[PDB]
Amino acid sequence: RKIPWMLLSARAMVQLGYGVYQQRIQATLSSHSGILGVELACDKEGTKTILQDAGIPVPRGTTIQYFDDLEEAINDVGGYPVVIKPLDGNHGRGITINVRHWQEAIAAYDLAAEESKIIVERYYEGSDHRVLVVNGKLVAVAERIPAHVTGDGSSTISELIEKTNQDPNRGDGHDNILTKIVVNKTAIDVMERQGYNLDSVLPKDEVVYLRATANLSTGGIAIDRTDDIHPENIWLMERVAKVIGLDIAGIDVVTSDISKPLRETNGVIVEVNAAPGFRMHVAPSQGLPRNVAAPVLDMLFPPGTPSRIPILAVTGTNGKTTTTRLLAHIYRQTGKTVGYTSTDAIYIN
């Protein structure tokens, strides 16, 4: 689009445009991102309160200050299919997704208990969808699925992992579309809960997950679903971004069918994210790539506006300084701020 850019000396920032038309970015945050919106979005309890007061569907759940009160908390939620999270963040760690028994709840507690002080949310069924909203308007939707293998013939899990980890689209990271599946103690733990281990042969079309959550960096996949989203769901997502106060936002939605209204599929909005990444939308494993940046530059530099200021460059063997001062004096008579440089000094007005 012919917009000039520069790196700045501090905090890894980038400047776009010249003079009075300049904008700044830092990764996925910009000069239009407010602090109150960004801080509210990082407060999980604050975010939930604000959204449910607006009539937006969110998970049912409570808080415990690390007391052994789970046996009671489960009663407010309505039963054992619950989710236990650390009471603060430390990346995507310390989370148990589907507790069904008391003993499981205890184990989940001890792990959640490692972080600073929701613990028992109701568990909802469905897939994990990421929705990207840029200026109060929807840009992209992607469905995310965790690393897995399936009953692709009567083979064992260890054989299936080696079979699919040879795919030419997998390797390293940001080098290719997908990464490698790695078996570690956490893959074993996820499989044990499903009744499987590495030497087991899967039934035709059985799916076994090797990870608790979806992420392209851990070997999962992302499917473009941008054109399959229902008009009412589009309206709701845009309203969520405006209620929180974010310009660029990622919204985490759990639903069984993105093509039906969330009230009919009993879906919920799980989280709002300031400064979301773009990889799953610009490099999906299935579907068509989307130009995510174009809507960002359109809000920073709206159509019809300049990104540059006039530049008058003067050269030659003799007479440059005199010509430069006169020309700056003439532009100054129009009432504008004129900056100039010469061999004597740098001046502004």
Partner: peptide
């Protein structure tokens, strides 16, 4: 802490 910047590509959420």
């Amino acid at each position: 802490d910047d590509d959420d």
